[PDB]
TrEMBL record, chain A:
Positions bound to ADP: 97, 101, 106, 153-158, 199
Protein name: Unconventional myosin-VI
GO molecular function, one term: actin filament binding
Actin-binding: annotated span: 631-653
Superkingdom, natural source: Eukaryota
Binding site for ATP: 150-157
Entry's family note: Belongs to the TRAFAC class myosin-kinesin ATPase superfamily. Myosin family.
Binding-site residues for Mg(2+) 1, renumbered to this chain: 157
Entry keyword annotation includes ATP-binding: yes
Length: 797, 367
């Protein structure tokens, strides 16, 4: 409406206040409220209606008159300076990290205050989700799941620890399992956590820490499960990225009585480390403790990497302290270093072309002493390993050896490193689960923590599997939100109603459908006698010529993406928008070739620790299918349990206390799927206010007679007086529900003509006396029917 | 944004932004469809390969130059040249830059209109202009007077310009050099028993036309020493391992530029077309057309030019007249360095034909 404030797109704050002083077909001439005369232009989809009272905050976001992402951004801007870091959006908890310890919130008196209290009546906190998940376990007769997203530094580690604290305090009577995850956190900071372009410490796996509950409601055990891993990162990294952190912390923290036994050298030597960044994280004090022979030329030129918490020299010490606490001796700790060092001496093995004698490939002469120092770490013979890295062993039933091509041997040598390190991380997790064996199993409350929608300027194959994992989790997110709203309307007595659902199945079919999907073409290209990346890119727009979820790079508005040639990349639209991916090295990173001749050699090792790691047809196997198959084992498990979605917000780039950046927070609202769920709720009734809320707001505008009434009869009389439309306004059980922009329309009816409103209250005065009679008459008949129940029941005792 | 100078070569299409060094993309203009059936199953094959890829895939395609005798074969193939050039070589969208395009002098109407019109609707450039390749070579050499030579495979031209006005009455277009020199070389290499008749193989002929050929000081005296036992032969090596030894024909092929009677065509040599265009200009101006004779185009890069041209002109020209023939290095990129200087200057920004003005005016604005 005219004259009414709208939100305006301001680059430094996301949205600010502003008014509309001219308009065109597609654009609005926006004049800011605080900066008059600045008068810019904005499009129809870039403006949002603002509320009249903007100085107030709400605990529950369904109490807003205008529910959008600009009024959600202003609600968590006001709450940030009131130190209210938790915010209730239906079944979604929005938690904002303050980087400081707030008083009394983690208190045990606070924990027993929340215990058993109804929902929504207590202030938002993370203990109000954990108490709800215990009650929607035992009552429901179904297991539960807490889903934690967000980027690194957003508080997703700290929110996980408060969940496990509440279960071993409020309901668990004893069981000290809570901090055994926390105490062996540096093991997963080495093995699983790596370095990405926008994050220094990022988890690259689906952490599923589950807590077993028995039928008697006691904590009987826990279990840690892991899903996904970046197979490519193990052997080849991007620009300025690192590999996993155990390949830097072992290099930085190793002593010289360990270096003589593992034959370690500086990272420049090793091909699985020199591709990316070789620099260590350190501080001034630990920079003095790093030995000269551990330093690479890049380390000499550019020095240590700066982080306030990461220290690759000092956290190797706090890793080996944690291996003493968890359950590992020094001999078993050394065997977890012999496997890591064997991977480093595998990547330097090169393959030339054979001298016409029987076809195939042979090893290079510069790779001879490098094989001798690697085969004793793997427990195998150097003459048998040379055959196994060059031949395809089969039978004619004699057993023949048929040599492989040069490119197939480079892919098979890196496939051994993507198999040994894959089973090594599964051995670390299984060893940790044997340090706290569960007593029994029945019901479970687990925490799924994984990285959010993460993307860079030029996206890789590693980020393609992350954004594909978040799209499938976005499908299940909106599926659980629609089910909660349909059983809210029924619970308030409004019954069933039609709501429009948004589908993303066409984006899923684009990526993973049989024969036509992007991952299906990628796995087929490996089978060709000559694989290409130009043939892969052209095949995507061969089979998918139409569709809106996919375009050419030149169609993008961004200049950087317009420099990409047609056969060098593609743009795939996801829930968080249009994300471009380049296709160079995509097939190479997907191609894995672990075959019989090498799979049945590392299992046959003379070393015993190596055989413990590994517990015709198919040759090259299906590599692009393992990423779909492993994810389906988690999605159907999430469908079998309840869900508790906790979205974690990072408020500023520096990660320092009391700083709000609305050009970085708004980007995480649109990359969390929060804005998508607010679009869904416009289809229903997004604005709802309890009877006590509408009594505190509107009693001053009413006559003194109407003001004397109780909140439910005050609202019932007010709804009847005005004569409101039944499809727009709905009278619930504890709340009044509204269609979009009709709580706002309601607020203007109360601010309109006092004499007209007084006359409508006069006209409903007979009905109001009759309603107030029947209220006390049927309440006295209620006490008499409960007196007749006490007698009827005690007649059968 | 930065303006883009894209030269409609006869060769050898040339492309690079405005200023200040050298072209970014140069490639042989060829489009080639695959003449044999594929059996690989990928399939992985393109519908039409452009250069450079069509010069790496010789012998399985049928090479077709899209511009022949100074005029384009069809705009269906020409659009693919343009699309390939902007997108997969230069990596730029036409909506980002005002462009500068080139043409050939004495080219039939309505082929500048149809070009301009199609390019505005297909590529949606915000502004454009079309300059003849010969005029641009004045700027490249830093001259303001002289006769300008745009000589590419297979149309040469002779345009006289005087400080700083052009003379319409003396403009000469010869369809003589260089693609007919390529065809003639193939006809006198068959005389030594090497059969290169096929379209792909014709490119190899073009490559030996570049590297091994030379111009004589005097034909008759080079022919005399050819009859002698002393070797003029140079040995070329061929992709299939063959060794080709050419001698006599080595100086015969370029000499055609001074004697077209070798091809049997009636037209007169560069020698005489230079003189006869000068002697179609007014008396006072003739004085400064001599000594501003500027050669341009890649087909003038033979070693014996310009000092053959010099000796021949000095013999026909009036006695005691100062004659210097200007031939710098890099003549193949002369045109591009010309265009670069032009499009950077004020006020020529306002000489460009912009889209709104073109939309109102239509094809009649061109001239």
């Amino acid at each position: 409406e005219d004259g009414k404030p709208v939100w305006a797109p301001h680059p430094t704050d996301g949205f600010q206040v502003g008014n509309i002083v001219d308009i065109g077909p597609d654009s609005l001439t926006i004049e800011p409220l605080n900066q008059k005369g600045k008068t810019f232009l904005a499009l129809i989809n870039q403006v949002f209606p603002a509320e009249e009272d903007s100085k107030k905050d709400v605990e529950d976001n369904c109490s807003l008159m205008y529910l959008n992402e600009a009024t959600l951004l202003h609600n968590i801007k006001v709450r940030y300076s009131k130190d209210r870091i938790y915010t209730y959006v239906a079944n979604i908890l929005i938690a904002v990290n303050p980087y400081f310890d707030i008083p009394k919130i983690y208190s045990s008196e606070t924990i027993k205050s929340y215990q058993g209290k109804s929902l929504g009546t207590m202030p938002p906190h993370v203990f109000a989700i954990a108490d709800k998940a215990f009650r929607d376990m035992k009552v429901l007769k179904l297991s539960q799941s807490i889903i934690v997203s967000g980027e690194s530094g957003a508080g997703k580690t700290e929110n996980t620890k408060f969940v496990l604290r509440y279960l071993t305090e409020s309901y668990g009577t004893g069981q000290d399992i809570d901090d055994r995850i926390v105490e062996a956190n540096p093991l997963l900071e080495a093995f699983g956590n790596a370095k990405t372009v926008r994050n220094n410490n990022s988890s690259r796996f689906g952490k599923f820490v589950e807590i077993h509950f028995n039928e008697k409601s006691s904590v009987v055990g826990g279990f840690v499960s892991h899903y996904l891993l970046e197979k490519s990162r193990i052997c080849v990294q991007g620009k300025e990225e690192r590999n996993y952190h155990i390949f830097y912390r072992l290099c930085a923290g190793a002593s010289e009585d360990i270096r003589e036994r593992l034959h370690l050298s500086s990272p420049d030597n090793f091909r699985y480390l020199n591709r990316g960044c070789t620099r260590y994280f350190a501080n001034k004090e630990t920079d003095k403790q790093i030995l000269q022979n551990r330093k690479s030329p890049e380390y000499l030129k550019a020095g240590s990497l700066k982080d306030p918490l990461l220290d690759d020299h000092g956290d190797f010490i706090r890793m080996c302290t944690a291996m003493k606490k968890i359950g590992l001796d020094d001999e078993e700790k050394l065997d977890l270093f012999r496997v890591v060092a064997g991977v480093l001496h595998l990547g330097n093995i090169d393959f030339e072309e054979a001298g016409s004698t029987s076809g195939g490939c042979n090893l290079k002469n510069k790779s001879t002493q490098a094989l001798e120092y690697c085969a004793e770490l793997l427990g195998l013979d150097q003459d048998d390993l040379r055959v196994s890295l060059t031949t395809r062993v089969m039978l004619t039933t004699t057993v023949i050896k048929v040599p492989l091509k040069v490119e197939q041997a480079n892919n098979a040598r890196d496939a051994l490193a993507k198999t040994v390190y894959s089973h090594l991380f599964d051995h670390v997790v299984n060893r940790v689960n044997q340090c706290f064996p569960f007593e029994t199993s029945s019901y479970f409350i687990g925490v799924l923590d994984i990285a959010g929608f993460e993307y860079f300027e030029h996206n890789s194959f590693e980020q393609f599997c992350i954004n594909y994992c978040n799209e499938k989790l976005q499908q299940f997110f909106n599926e659980r939100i629609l089910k909660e709203e349909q059983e809210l309307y029924q619970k308030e007595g409004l019954g069933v109603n039609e709501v429009h659902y948004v589908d993303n199945q066409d984006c899923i079919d684009l990526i993973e459908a049989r024969l036509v999907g992007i991952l299906d073409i990628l796995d087929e290209e490996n089978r060709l006698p000559q694989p290409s990346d130009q043939h892969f890119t052209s095949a995507v727009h061969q089979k998918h010529k139409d569709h809106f979820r996919l375009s050419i790079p030149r169609k993008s508005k961004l200049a950087i993406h317009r420099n990409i040639r047609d056969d060098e990349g593609f743009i795939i639209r996801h829930f968080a928008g249009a994300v471009c991916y380049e296709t160079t090295q995509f097939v190479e990173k997907n191609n894995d070739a672990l075959h019989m001749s090498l799979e049945s050699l590392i299992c046959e090792s003379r070393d015993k620790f190596i055989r413990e790691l590994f517990e015709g047809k198919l040759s090259f196997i299906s590599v692009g299918n393992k990423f779909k198959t492993q994810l389906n084992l988690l999605l159907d498990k999430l469908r079998s349990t309840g869900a508790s979605f906790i979205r974690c917000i990072k408020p500023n780039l520096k990660m320092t206390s009391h700083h709000f950046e609305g050009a970085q927070i708004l980007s995480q609202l649109q990359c969390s799927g929060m804005v998508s769920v607010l679009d869904l709720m416009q289809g229903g009734f997004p604005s709802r206010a309890s009877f006590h809320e509408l009594y505190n707001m509107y009693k001053k505008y009413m006559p003194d007679k109407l003001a004397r009434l109780d909140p439910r009869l005050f609202c019932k009389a007010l709804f009847k007086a005005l004569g409101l439309n039944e499809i727009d306004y709905k009278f619930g059980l504890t709340k009044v529900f509204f269609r979009p922009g009709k709580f706002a329309e309601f607020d203007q009816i109360m601010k309109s003509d006092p004499d007209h409103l007084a006359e409508l209250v006069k006209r409903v005065n007979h009905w109001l006396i009759c309603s107030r009679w029947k209220k006390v008459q049927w309440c006295s008949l209620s006490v008499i029917k409960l007196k007749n129940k006490i007698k009827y029941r005690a007649e059968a005792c | 944004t930065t303006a883009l100078v894209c030269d409609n070569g006869s060769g050898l299409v040339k492309a690079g932004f405005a200023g200040d060094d050298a072209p970014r993309a140069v490639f042989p203009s060829i489009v080639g469809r695959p003449r044999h059936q594929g059996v690989m199953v990928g399939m992985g094959q393109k519908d039409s390969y452009v250069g450079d890829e069509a010069q790496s895939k010789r012998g399985i395609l049928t090479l077709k130059y899209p511009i022949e005798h100074g005029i384009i074969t069809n705009w269906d193939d020409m659009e693919k040249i343009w699309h390939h050039t902007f997108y997969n070589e230069l990596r730029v969208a036409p909506e980002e830059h005002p462009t500068l395009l080139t043409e050939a002098p004495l080219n039939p109407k309505a082929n500048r209109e149809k070009m301009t019109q199609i390019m505005f609707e297909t590529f949606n450039v915000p502004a454009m202009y079309v300059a003849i390749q010969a005029v641009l070579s004045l700027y490249a050499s830093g001259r303001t007077t002289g006769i300008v030579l745009d000589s590419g495979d297979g149309v040469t031209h002779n345009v006289p310009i005087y400080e700083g006005y052009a003379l319409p009455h003396a403009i000469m277009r010869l369809d003589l050099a260089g693609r007919d020199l390529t065809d003639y070389l193939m006809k006198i290499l068959t005389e030594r028993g090497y059969s290169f008749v096929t379209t792909a193989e014709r490119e190899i002929v073009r490559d030996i036309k570049e590297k091994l050929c030379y111009v004589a000081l005097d034909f008759e005296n080079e022919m005399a020493t050819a009859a002698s036992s002393s070797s003029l032969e140079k040995s070329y090596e061929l992709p299939d391992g063959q060794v080709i030894t050419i001698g006599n024909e080595r100086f015969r092929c370029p000499e055609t530029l001074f004697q077209p009677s070798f091809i049997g065509m009636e037209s007169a040599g560069i020698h005489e077309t230079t003189y006869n265009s000068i002697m179609k200009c007014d008396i006072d101006i003739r004085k400064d057309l001599y000594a501003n004779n500027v050669m341009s185009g890649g087909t003038t890069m033979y070693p014996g030019i310009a000092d053959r041209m010099q000796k021949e002109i000095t013999a026909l020209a009036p006695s005691t007249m100062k004659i210097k023939i200007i031939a710098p290095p890099e003549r193949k990129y002369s045109v591009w360095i010309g265009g670069s200087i032009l499009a950077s200057l004020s006020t020529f920004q306002q000489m460009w034909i912009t889209k709104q003005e073109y939309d109102e005016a239509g094809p009649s604005i061109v001239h």
